[PDB]
C-alpha cells in the first residue's frame, strides 16, 4: 500500500519543515524588531533555504497520486504539497513575471504626485498624499491629490499590468485552471467530503446572493451620506446622483470612517472614550495585556505561555532601535507565540490588544496538528476570529466590569446610534467596494472585458454597484485599479468580504449560547465558559476539516449567511429609514458626474 509510503514521507517532512520554518520566522522577527544591515541579509538567507526546501519537497510529493489514498488527513496534507503554482512556466517566463511584479511593487512604493500649482510639492503616497486625502475639506486640494496619484503612478502601471494578466493567465491555464480568477477562487474549494463539499463556482453564487441582501442597507447609508455631504460641498453634489470619488475620506474610498465628523447623528452626546480613565489609574502597557488575558481566561480559554511575556515587545524600545510600528501576532513555530506592538495608553490600543491576542489564542488551538494543517479553516477565518473579541471588549458592560467606567454609568440610547453609525462606515461602507473590485478582476482574468474596455467597464461598474462617479474623464491610458495596494502587489481581495460575513455569524452564534437578552450589538461573551468551549472546539480543528464542517461546528450551518450582519445593524437601519423620509434613496448611473 502506497499510503504507508506517504506516511513516512509526511513524517520526515513535518520535522524538516518545523525545524526550517522556525529559523525563517525568527530571522523575520529579528529584522522587524531591530532594523539593521546584518539582520536583513540574515532574513533573506534564511528565507531562501526555506523556499528551496519547500520547492524540493513539493516536487517530490507528486510521486504519490491522490486517487488511491483513503485517509482524509493524509490526502489533505498531500494536496497542499502537490498544489504547484508559478513553478510551471519556462525559466524565461518565470523571471519575466518576477521582474514585472517587482517593477509594479517598486513603482507603487516609490511614486510621487506634485502640485499643479506648486512645483515643489512632490509628495509620496504614504506620508503626504494620504494626509491630504484623509484630513482635508478643500474640494480642489482633494481633487488634485486624487488626480495626481491616478495620473503619475496609475498611468505607467498599465503596460506592466497588461503583461501581468497574460503571464498569470498562462500559469493558471498550465495548472488545469480556467484562468487566474479560478486559481484565486480555489482557496474556498473543498473536495471528497460527504455533504461538506464546495465548488469554485459556488463562491460567486454565494457572494452575489449575500450582496443582493446587503444592498438595501447600503442604499440607505449612501443616501444619508450623500445628503450630509451636500452641506460641506455646496453646489457640487447632485441630490439624486452618485458621489464624487475624491470626497470619500481616503484615496480610494475603501472605508468611509473618515467622514464621521461631518455626519455625527447626535452632536451633543460624546462617544464613550476611556483614555482619560486609563491615565488616571496609572495604566502602563503591561496592564492592558494582563486585562486582555484575563478577559480571554474568563471565557474558558488558556492563559498566555511563559515565553509570551519574556519574548514579546509590548513597548517601543528607547535605545535608538529601529522597529516597525505595525501591530502583529507572530506564530514563530515550535509553540512560540509573540506579539509586536508599540502600545500607547489609549482606547484604540486597548482594543488592538484584544484583536491581536485573539490571533494568538487561535494559534494556540491548532498547535497539535500536522505542519501543513496548521492554519485557519480558510483565509477568512483567522481575521474573523480576532474581530469578535474586539466587538465584545468595547461593550459598556465590559468596560464597567473591568473598572474603566463609573459603576453608576447609564447607557444612553443616543450614543448607541453614534456607535452604530461609526461602525457602519468601515463595515457596510466597504462591502460594495471590495465586491466590485473583485468582480472586475475576475472578468479581466476571464477575458469578458477586453484590454480595450478596462477603464470603461471599471467606471461603469463603480457607478452601478458602488454608486461613486469619477471627478474627471479617464480614457484608456490609466490603470485606476492598479493604484490600490493589493492590485499592484498581487493579493487576493475576497478574503475581506467573507471575513465580514463570518464575523457576525460567529458572534450571534456565541451570543445565544451565552444567554444574552436584547440587541445583538450590546452582547458580551465574557464570564461565559460554555461559549468559550464551543469556539475552542472549532479553533482546535485547524485546516484539518472542510471549512463548511468547521463553520457548522459553531453556527449550525454550512453556508455563508448575511442575516446576522443585518440583525446587528437593525436599530441603525430603522434610524436611517426614519431620517431618509424627506430624501431620495438610490442613485443615477449615467447622470451628473
Amino acid at each position: 500500500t502506497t499510503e504507508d509510503l506517504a506516511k513516512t514521507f509526511l513524517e520526515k517532512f513535518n520535522y524538516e519543515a518545523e525545524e526550517l520554518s522556525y529559523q525563517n520566522s525568527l530571522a523575520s522577527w529579528n529584522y522587524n524588531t531591530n532594523i539593521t544591515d546584518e539582520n536583513i541579509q540574515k532574513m533573506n538567507i534564511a528565507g531562501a533555504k526555506w523556499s528551496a526546501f519547500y520547492e524540493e519537497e513539493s516536487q517530490h510529493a507528486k510521486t504519490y497520486p491522490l486517487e488511491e489514498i483513503q485517509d482524509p488527513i493524509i490526502k489533505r496534507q498531500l494536496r497542499a504539497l502537490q498544489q504547484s503554482g508559478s513553478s510551471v512556466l519556462s525559466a524565461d517566463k518565470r523571471e519575466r513575471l518576477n521582474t514585472i511584479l517587482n517593477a509594479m511593487s517598486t513603482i507603487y512604493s516609490t511614486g510621487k504626485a506634485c502640485n499643479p500649482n506648486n512645483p515643489q510639492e512632490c509628495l509620496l503616497l504614504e506620508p503626504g498624499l494620504d494626509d491630504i486625502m484623509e484630513n482635508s475639506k478643500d474640494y480642489n486640494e482633494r481633487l488634485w491629490a486624487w488626480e495626481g496619484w491616478r495620473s503619475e503612478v496609475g498611468k505607467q502601471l498599465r503596460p506592466l499590468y497588461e503583461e501581468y494578466v497574460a503571464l498569470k493567465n498562462e500559469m493558471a491555464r498550465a495548472n488545469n485552471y480556467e484562468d487566474y480568477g479560478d486559481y484565486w477562487r480555489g482557496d474556498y474549494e473543498e473536495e471528497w467530503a460527504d455533504g461538506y463539499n464546495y465548488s469554485r463556482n459556488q463562491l460567486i453564487e454565494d457572494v452575489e446572493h449575500t450582496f443582493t441582501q446587503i444592498k438595501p442597507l447600503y442604499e440607505h447609508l449612501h443616501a444619508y451620506v450623500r445628503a450630509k455631504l451636500m452641506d460641506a460641498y455646496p453646489s457640487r453634489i447632485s441630490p439624486t446622483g452618485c458621489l464624487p470619488a475624491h470626497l470619500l475620506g481616503d484615496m480610494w474610498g475603501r472605508f468611509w470612517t473618515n467622514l464621521y465628523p461631518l455626519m455625527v447623528p447626535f452632536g451633543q452626546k460624546p462617544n464613550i472614550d476611556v483614555t482619560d480613565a486609563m491615565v488616571n489609574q496609572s495604566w502602563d502597557a503591561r496592564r492592558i495585556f494582563k486585562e486582555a488575558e484575563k478577559f480571554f481566561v474568563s471565557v474558558g480559554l488558556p492563559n498566555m505561555t511563559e515565553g509570551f511575556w519574556q519574548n514579546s515587545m509590548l513597548t517601543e524600545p528607547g535605545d535608538n532601535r529601529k522597529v516597525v510600528c505595525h501591530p502583529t501576532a507572530w506564530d514563530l513555530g515550535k509553540h512560540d507565540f509573540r506579539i509586536k506592538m508599540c502600545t500607547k495608553v489609549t482606547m484604540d490600543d486597548f482594543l488592538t490588544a484584544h484583536h491581536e491576542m485573539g490571533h494568538i489564542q487561535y494559534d494556540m488551538a491548532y498547535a497539535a496538528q500536522p505542519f501543513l494543517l496548521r492554519n485557519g479553516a480558510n483565509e477568512g477565518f483567522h481575521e474573523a476570529v480576532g474581530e469578535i473579541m474586539s466587538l465584545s471588549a468595547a461593550t459598556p458592560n465590559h468596560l464597567k466590569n473591568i473598572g474603566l467606567l463609573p459603576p453608576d454609568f447609564s447607557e444612553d440610547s443616543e450614543t448607541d446610534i453614534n456607535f452604530l453609525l461609526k461602525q457602519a462606515l468601515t463595515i457596510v461602507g466597504t462591502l460594495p467596494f471590495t465586491y466590485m473590485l473583485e468582480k472586475w478582476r475576475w472578468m479581466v482574468f476571464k477575458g469578458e472585458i477586453p484590454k480595450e474596455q478596462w477603464m470603461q467597464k471599471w467606471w461603469e461598474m463603480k457607478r452601478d454597484i458602488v454608486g461613486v462617479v469619477e471627478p474627471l474623464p479617464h480614457d484608456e491610458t490609466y490603470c485606476d485599479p492598479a493604484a490600490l495596494f493589493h492590485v499592484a502587489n498581487d493579493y487576493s481581495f475576497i478574503r475581506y468580504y467573507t471575513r465580514t460575513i463570518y464575523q457576525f455569524q460567529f458572534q450571534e452564534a456565541l451570543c445565544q449560547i451565552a444567554k444574552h437578552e436584547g440587541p445583538l450589538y450590546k452582547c458580551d461573551i465574557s464570564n461565559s465558559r460554555e461559549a468559550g468551549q464551543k469556539l475552542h472546539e472549532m479553533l482546535s480543528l485547524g485546516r484539518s476539516k472542510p471549512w463548511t464542517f468547521a463553520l457548522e461546528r459553531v453556527v449550525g450551518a454550512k453556508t455563508m449567511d448575511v442575516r446576522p450582519l443585518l440583525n446587528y445593524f437593525e436599530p441603525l437601519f430603522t434610524w436611517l429609514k426614519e431620517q431618509n423620509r424627506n430624501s431620495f434613496v438610490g442613485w443615477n448611473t449615467d447622470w451628473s458626474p
Binding site: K7, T8, L10, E11, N14, Y15, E18, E19, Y22, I73, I74, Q77, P302, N303, T305, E306, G307, Q310, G333, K334, H335, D336, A367, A368, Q369, P370, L373
Partner: protein, 201 residues
C-alpha cells in the same frame, strides 16, 4: 547525625526538568542555617506552615532542588497550567509541601553558576497525524529526560529520537543568568510509616 546538605552546596545546580532529589531519613536537620547560607526571597507552604516546617519531626524529608529564577515563580504556582508544569515539574500536593526561593551571594564560590537557565517547552510524540503531547505526572519526571540529557545550546533547540512508529521530540528554551544566582527548593514531608527520626537540631 546532621543531614548532609553538601550536594546542593557543591557543583552546578541542576535545571528544573532534571531536578535533584535527596531523601533525608534518620538525621538532624537545621534548615535555618541553610536558609542563612542564601538570600531568601520567597517562601510559600501548602498544608503546612513555615514554623511547622522548621519544627516537627517527619518520617521522610524529600528535597527536590534545582536552579530557578524569581521572575518565573508565578508560573510554578498551583493550578496554573503552563510549560513548566506540563513539561518540567508538577508539584505533588497530596502531601504538605513548601516552595522556597533563595539567592546565592557572590561570596559562595563553592557553587558554580551555569551559563543559562534551561526549561523544556515541548516534549511530544510525533506521528504523521500531528502531535501528541506528553504531560508530566505529579511528582514524577518527564518522558524526555534521556533525550534532553544531551543539553541545549541555543534558544528553542530541539532533539529528536526515532521510534518504531514515529519519533519523539523535545525542545528547550535558554535564558542567560545575570546577577546573583537564584535557586529553588521543593520540600515535602512524609508522616506515613517509618520513624519520625528526621528531627530538628
Amino acid at each position: 547525625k546532621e543531614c548532609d546538605f553538601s550536594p546542593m552546596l557543591q557543583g552546578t545546580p541542576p535545571p528544573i526538568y532534571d531536578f535533584k532529589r535527596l531523601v533525608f531519613t534518620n538525621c538532624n536537620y537545621n534548615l535555618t542555617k541553610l536558609l542563612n547560607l542564601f538570600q531568601v526571597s520567597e517562601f510559600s507552604c501548602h498544608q503546612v506552615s513555615p514554623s511547622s516546617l522548621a519544627t516537627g519531626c517527619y518520617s521522610s524529608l524529600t528535597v527536590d532542588y534545582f536552579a530557578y529564577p524569581t521572575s518565573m515563580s508565578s508560573y510554578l504556582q498551583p493550578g496554573f497550567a503552563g510549560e513548566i508544569v506540563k513539561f518540567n515539574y508538577k508539584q505533588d500536593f497530596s502531601s504538605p509541601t513548601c516552595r522556597v526561593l533563595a539567592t546565592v551571594p557572590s561570596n559562595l564560590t563553592t557553587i558554580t553558576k551555569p551559563s543559562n537557565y534551561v526549561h523544556l517547552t515541548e516534549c511530544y510524540k510525533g506521528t504523521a497525524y500531528g502531535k501528541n503531547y506528553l504531560y508530566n505526572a505529579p511528582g514524577g519526571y518527564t518522558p524526555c529526560l534521556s533525550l534532553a540529557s544531551s543539553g541545549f545550546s541555543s534558544d528553542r533547540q530541539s532533539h529528536r529520537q526515532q521510534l518504531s512508529d514515529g519519533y519523539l521530540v523535545t525542545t528547550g528554551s535558554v535564558y542567560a543568568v545575570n546577577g546573583n544566582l537564584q535557586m529553588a527548593f521543593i520540600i515535602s514531608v512524609q508522616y506515613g510509616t517509618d520513624t519520625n527520626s528526621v528531627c530538628p537540631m
